[PDB]
Structures are given as structure tokens and as C-alpha cells.
Amino acid sequence: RNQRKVYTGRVVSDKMDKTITVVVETYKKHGLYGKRVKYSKKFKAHDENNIAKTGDVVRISETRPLSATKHFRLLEVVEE
Amino acid sequence: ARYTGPSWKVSRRLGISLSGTGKELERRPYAPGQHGPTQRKKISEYGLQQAEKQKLRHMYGLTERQFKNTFNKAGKLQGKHGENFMILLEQRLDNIVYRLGLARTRRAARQLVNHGHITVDGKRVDIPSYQVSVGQVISVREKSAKNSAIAESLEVSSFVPEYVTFDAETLTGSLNRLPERSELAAEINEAFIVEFYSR
């Protein structure tokens, strides 16, 4: 069975129902000079029962589009 | 004969006696023109590099554009760029006929190849710039055969280089092997040729 893609980030906002906003931090070297730089773009994940809280560290997996913006689902809550 | 002008001044201007000797010396050995006998002058670095190009170009008698093209593909080989240039030029069908003794000068040899008078491997070839390989046989294929001009030039042939084999009964010339730089010209500075094209 082919496997989807799983990320890991930090919850930012839970003011919406059934969903959370997760920022994923990642590295990428600059094109010409060659220095690693922080890069963060936040996603949307599906919180089935509002388990995750602000500031938690979670794992999210890719799915079919659940909404206009959500296409990830929450998998684990690693840290609180 | 791409350059049909007098082939006597070019030896005088260059200072080297093309085709053996006599064109430069004996007569006026100084440069042609009104200001030949007097009014000498120094030569800069550009002049020395440029004058080396002119010797090879006018010795083998070929145009500028070909000279640039054959220089580029000569340097694609393995070894010294300058030495590979004379080796590659030595391969030309004009020079081989000149080396065999069927013609007196390179201009005579070029016309001889041009007017379908020779054959390689039994097939007529009319391209002067054909690159001969090692082992191929070159003949005349009868027709002209006992021609007065070709037979006259056979007698006045001095010597024959060791990398070409030719007997004057079947006129079957051949290249024994690829020649060596030491046994070519020896009065040209190939290091100046390669420096000229790198500016």
C-alpha cells in the first residue's frame, strides 16, 4: 500500500472548530551563498475531538481535501 | 588555387623561403613594396604572434576560415595542441600528393587533385582538403597516366619523406604511419600559433 506524507510541527491556534494550525519549521540553504536559513509555513490539520491545545507538538498526515484549506489530519500529540 | 597572386613576395615578406629555397634569397631578400630596401622597423608582440600564423597559412596555402576550423578540431585530440596541428594538416590530400613528387609545388598538386586526376582506394576524389588515413593507397587511375606535366615533376622530386611510400611504376602512394613533429618544417614556432588564438 502506497503511503502518504507525514510532517511534524507545533500548534499555533485553536480558535476554530475541529481544526488546528500547525507551523512546520524547516531548513534550506541559500541559492548563491550557501547558508542554511529558517523557513516556516503553517498548515491546517483536522482535530477530530479538539484534543490538541495551543503550543503542543503534534504529527499530521496528508489526506484528501477536507475543506477549502484543510488537507492534513492530526495523527499524534507528542508533547504538551 | 584559392590565392592566385604572385607566389614570390609572400616568401619575401615572411622571410622564410617557401618550397625549398630561392624565392627569398638570391634575388632581393628584403620585403616587397616601395619601402623595402630601406626603412626597417621593430616588431611588437602582436606582430611576432601574427607573423607565425601567416607562415603556416601560406605554406600549406589554405584560407583563414578553414585554418581556424582545423585548428579547433586539432586541439580536441590528446597531446600537445601545437604539434597536433601540423600533424593534422600534414594529412591533407594536397600535401600527400606534393610529398609523393607527382607535382612540383603545392599549387600544382592542388590543381592535380582538383581536376579528378588522382584516386584513393580506387575511387575518384576531388576535395583537396580530404584527410588521408594510414594504409590507404593513392593512384592516378590511368586517364592522364602518362601525362607530361606529371612525368616531368616525377624526375625533379629530390627526396621522399620516410612516412610516405611511393614507387614510380604504379604510382601507388601510401602513408606508412602518422608523422612526427620533429620531421615537419622545423622552422615554425607552434607555441606562438596557440598563443595567437587565445587572446
Binding site: - | 595542441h81 601545437g82 607555441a191 598563443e195 587565445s198
Partner: protein, 156 residues
């Protein structure tokens, strides 16, 4: 028996009451193709006499250039005042690729294949100084092992 090559002849002047007095300065590179080269400077009221002074001067700055396979052992960078020269080894048969006054110190020295680039000023006297400042840094492989206590085959 060495070889001479006049690089630059320049006319200079100092101002004195009545008018200007002019003098000629000549820069000459001298050496044999076996590996010895030197440069000098002269000054006189005539061009032929400025060369003769510079030839004698140049016979007092002789330096030795180490080469392997008609090429410098490695890459060096000269530096003297506002001029600096980069010298780089090149493949056999390529020939010397150098600027105006730096060709003389290389053709006379006997180097047959070397590439260079003048990254600094343009003054002929400071290009000759900056070039010799690079030949000083030049070392052979045989002498490097001697200092480091190794052997030649161990180094390479």
C-alpha cells in the same frame, strides 16, 4: 651569455627655474632560458645609455625559478604595493598566457606553459615586482619532503 628585453622606456622631467629638464628611464628584464631571470632600472639623458645602466643593474637581482615539466609546481599569488599577479600551472603545449611585462619574466626564465592574470594595477615596474614576489613562494616537491622529513613518493 644572457638575453635582454626592454620593457618600457619613459621620459620624466623635473622643473628648474629656466624650464624643464627631461630624462629617460628604462626597465629591462634579463635572464637565460635555463631558469635564471632578473630585472633592473636605469636613468640617463639618452635612451641608449639608459638601457646600459639598466642591464648592469639587472645583473644584481638575479633569482632562480623552480619548474617541473616546463611548468611551475603549483599556484602562487604575488603582491607588491598596488600590483598583484596570479600564476597558475597549465597543461603542456598551451604556452604562456600573460600580460605585457609579466611575459618577459616568464619567457626569459624558460617557463614554457603557464597561465597568469593581473588582478592589481597596471604600472610596469609594480608588475615585475609583484611577479618576482610570487616566484619567491614557489617551492619544489623534492625540497618540501626534506623540510617535512618525508620522502617524495610519500608526499604525492
Amino acid at each position: 651569455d644572457l638575453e635582454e628585453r626592454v620593457v618600457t622606456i619613459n621620459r620624466v622631467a623635473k622643473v628648474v627655474k629656466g624650464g624643464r629638464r627631461f630624462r629617460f628611464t628604462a626597465l629591462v628584464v634579463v635572464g637565460d632560458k635555463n631558469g635564471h631571470v632578473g630585472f633592473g632600472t636605469g636613468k640617463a639623458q639618452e635612451v641608449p645609455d639608459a638601457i646600459r645602466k639598466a642591464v648592469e643593474d639587472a645583473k644584481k637581482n638575479m633569482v632562480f625559478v623552480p619548474t617541473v615539466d616546463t611548468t611551475i609546481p603549483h599556484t602562487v599569488v604575488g603582491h607588491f604595493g598596488g600590483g598583484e599577479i596570479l600564476l597558475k600551472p597549465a597543461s603542456a603545449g598551451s604556452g604562456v598566457t600573460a600580460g605585457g611585462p609579466v611575459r618577459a619574466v616568464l619567457e626569459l626564465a624558460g617557463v614554457a606553459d603557464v597561465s597568469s592574470k593581473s588582478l592589481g594595477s597596471n604600472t610596469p615596474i609594480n608588475m615585475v615586482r609583484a611577479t618576482i614576489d610570487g616566484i619567491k613562494q614557489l617551492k619544489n616537491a623534492e625540497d618540501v619532503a626534506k623540510l617535512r622529513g618525508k620522502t617524495v613518493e610519500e608526499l604525492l
